[PDB]
C-alpha cells in the first residue's frame, strides 16, 4: 500500500536548476522500478560508484537521495568522478565515498526552463540580482568565496574622504559588519595613495590572508559559498553614510554560463545516493 516514489516525475520536471543551485530530493518509504525509471527518463548513461548497479534491482534502502542540475555543454567532462574542473570544484562535488550512481539524461528543450539562482546569501545581501539570461543558459561558478557574517565589501566613507590619490568607493556597511580594510600608502609620486584589500581582485589577490573573501572549494552537500566581488566596485566614489553598500553587476567575478541544449534537448545530470542497503522501505519492485 506504499505509493510509487515518482522519481521520473521529479527528474522530468520542466523547471531545471543549474549546478550553482542544484536541487536535492530525498526519496523514501515508496516503491520504484529502476527499469521503468531508465525508460521514462531519456537516459544517456547510468552507472554506479562504490556500488554494484545490478544489486539495486529487488533491494530496499533507507532512502535514496538525488541531486540534479542541467549541464552546461562545455563543462560535461567536469562530472567525471574526481574531476578538478569547475563544476565539482565550485558547484557540486560528487561524493566518491558514498554508494552512488550517476545519471545523464535529457528533456525536450522546448519545455525546459532553466531556474538560475545565486544561493549565496552574502552575494545577495550586497546586491546580486536575479540572472537575466536566455531560458537555456546554465550558470556555473568558477570560484567560490566564503566570508564571515561580519563581512562588508565597502571602504568606510570617513577613511575614503582622507585619500588624496586612489580613493576607494565607499558606503555605509550594515550594522554588525566591519568596513573593508584600507591603508594609506606612499608611492614615488603620491603620498596618500589609499590601498585596500583583495587587490587586484579576490581571485588574483596579492595577499590572500588579508583578503576577507576566502577561496572555498565546495564540500560534500554544499553549494557555492559565493562569487568573489571586486571590492573596488562596491560602494560609490565619494559615497557617504547615506549610501547603502552594494556591489555593481560587474563586481561579481568568476562565474560563467553555457547552454545545455544539443540536438534540441537539454542535457541534465542527477546524482543518486543509496542509503542503508538492505534496510528501510525504499524498495525496488523490479523483480516482483
Amino acid at each position: 500500500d506504499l505509493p510509487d516514489c515518482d522519481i521520473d516525475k521529479w527528474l522530468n520536471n520542466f523547471n531545471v536548476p543549474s549546478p550553482l543551485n542544484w536541487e536535492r530530493k530525498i526519496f523514501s518509504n515508496c516503491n520504484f522500478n529502476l527499469s521503468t525509471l531508465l525508460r521514462l527518463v531519456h537516459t544517456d548513461s547510468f552507472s554506479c560508484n562504490n556500488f554494484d548497479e545490478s544489486k539495486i534491482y529487488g533491494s530496499c534502502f533507507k532512502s535514496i537521495v538525488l541531486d540534479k542540475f542541467a549541464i552546461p555543454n562545455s563543462r560535461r567532462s567536469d562530472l567525471q568522478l574526481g574531476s578538478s574542473g569547475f563544476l565539482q570544484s565550485s558547484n557540486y562535488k560528487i561524493d566518491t565515498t558514498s554508494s552512488s550512481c550517476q545519471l545523464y539524461y535529457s528533456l525536450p528543450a522546448i519545455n525546459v526552463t532553466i531556474n538560475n539562482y545565486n544561493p549565496s546569501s552574502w552575494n545577495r545581501r550586497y546586491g546580486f540580482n536575479n540572472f537575466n539570461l536566455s531560458s537555456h543558459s546554465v550558470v556555473y561558478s568558477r570560484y567560490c568565496f566564503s566570508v564571515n557574517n561580519t563581512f562588508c565589501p565597502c571602504a568606510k566613507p570617513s577613511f575614503a574622504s582622507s585619500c588624496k590619490s586612489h580613493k576607494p568607493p565607499s558606503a555605509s556597511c550594515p550594522i554588525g559588519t566591519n568596513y573593508r580594510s584600507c591603508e594609506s600608502t606612499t608611492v614615488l609620486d603620491h603620498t596618500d595613495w589609499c590601498r585596500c584589500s583583495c587587490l587586484p581582485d579576490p581571485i588574483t589577490a596579492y595577499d590572500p590572508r588579508s583578503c576577507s573573501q576566502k577561496k572555498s572549494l565546495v564540500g560534500v552537500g554544499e553549494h557555492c559559498a559565493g562569487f568573489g566581488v571586486d571590492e573596488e566596485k562596491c560602494g560609490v566614489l565619494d559615497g557617504s553614510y547615506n549610501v547603502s553598500c552594494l556591489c555593481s553587476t560587474d563586481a561579481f567575478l568568476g562565474w560563467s554560463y553555457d547552454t545545455c541544449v544539443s540536438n534540441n534537448r537539454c542535457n541534465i545530470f542527477s546524482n543518486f545516493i543509496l542509503n542503508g542497503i538492505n534496510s528501510g522501505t525504499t524498495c525496488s519492485n523490479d523483480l516482483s
Epitope: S89, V187, R195, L199, P200, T204, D207, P208, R209, K215
Partner: antibody, heavy 124, light 108 residues
C-alpha cells in the same frame, strides 16, 4: 622571455637616498605581473622589500614603510625603488624580479626572471 | 609575519644521491610555497612554484610536495651543477618571507 636589468649608483652616502631602476624587456609592465625588489645583505639570505602593480597597488616590508617607495612607469616599461635615510644596515645586493601568479585555482604568486642584482654599499 | 624554517641548514651529499630538504611555515599557507636555487655569484632561480609545479626548463630531478605547513624539496639524483643554497618562500601573506636557506655541498 621576460628579462630584467637593474641600474643605479652602487655607492650611497649614509642618510642618503638609494634609488634603483629596473628595466623590463620581453614583456609589458602593464600586465597581471607585479614587480618586486628583494635584497641580500652580505653573507645573509633573501629579504623581500616591496612589490608594486602598474595600477599603483603596492606592498612593502613593514619595517621599511617610513623610508621606502616604489613606482611603475608604463611609458618606459620600468619600475623603481627609493629607500630614504639609508645606513649600513641597507648595504646589500638588490635584485629586481617579476612576481606573477600561477594558473591554478590558488593563483600562487612567485618570483621569476630575476635580474642579475646591483651591489649597494652605504659608505662615506 | 609567517616564519619559514628549513631543515637541515646545510648538508653534504655525493653525485647521484637523493637530496631532501624540508620547510615548515609558522602557520598554514595551503600551497602558496615556492622553492629557489641560488648558485654562487648569481641571482636566485625559481625551481618549484605553488608547492609542486616544476618551472619550465628545470630538470625533472627536482620536485616539490606538501601543503599546509610542511613542504619538501627533493633532488632525485644530485649533479655537480646542483651545488647551491636552496630557499623556500611563502606568498599566502604579506610580507613575503623566505626560509633561511639550505646549503647543499657536494662530497667528492
Amino acid at each position: 622571455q621576460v628579462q630584467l636589468q637593474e641600474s643605479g649608483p652602487g655607492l650611497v652616502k649614509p642618510s642618503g637616498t638609494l634609488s634603483l631602476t629596473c628595466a623590463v624587456s620581453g614583456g609589458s609592465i602593464s600586465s597581471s605581473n607585479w614587480w618586486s625588489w628583494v635584497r641580500q645583505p652580505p653573507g645573509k639570505g633573501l629579504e623581500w622589500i616591496g612589490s608594486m602593480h602598474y595600477s599603483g597597488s603596492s606592498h612593502y616590508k613593514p619595517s621599511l614603510k617610513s623610508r621606502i617607495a616604489m613606482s611603475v612607469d608604463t611609458s618606459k616599461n620600468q619600475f623603481s625603488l627609493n629607500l630614504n635615510s639609508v645606513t649600513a644596515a641597507d648595504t646589500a645586493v638588490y635584485y629586481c624580479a617579476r612576481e606573477g601568479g600561477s594558473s591554478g585555482y590558488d593563483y600562487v604568486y612567485y618570483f621569476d626572471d630575476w635580474g642579475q642584482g646591483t651591489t649597494v654599499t652605504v659608505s662615506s | 609575519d609567517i616564519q619559514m624554517t628549513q631543515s637541515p641548514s646545510s648538508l653534504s651529499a655525493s653525485v647521484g644521491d637523493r637530496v631532501t630538504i624540508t620547510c615548515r611555515a609558522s602557520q598554514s599557507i595551503s600551497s602558496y610555497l615556492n622553492w629557489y636555487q641560488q648558485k654562487p655569484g648569481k641571482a636566485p632561480k625559481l625551481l618549484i612554484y605553488a608547492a609542486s609545479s616544476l618551472q619550465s626548463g628545470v630538470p625533472s630531478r627536482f620536485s616539490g610536495s606538501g601543503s599546509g605547513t610542511d613542504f619538501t624539496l627533493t633532488i632525485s639524483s644530485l649533479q655537480p651543477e646542483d651545488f647551491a643554497t636552496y630557499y623556500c618562500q611563502q606568498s599566502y601573506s604579506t610580507p613575503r618571507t623566505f626560509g633561511q636557506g639550505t646549503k647543499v655541498e657536494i662530497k667528492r
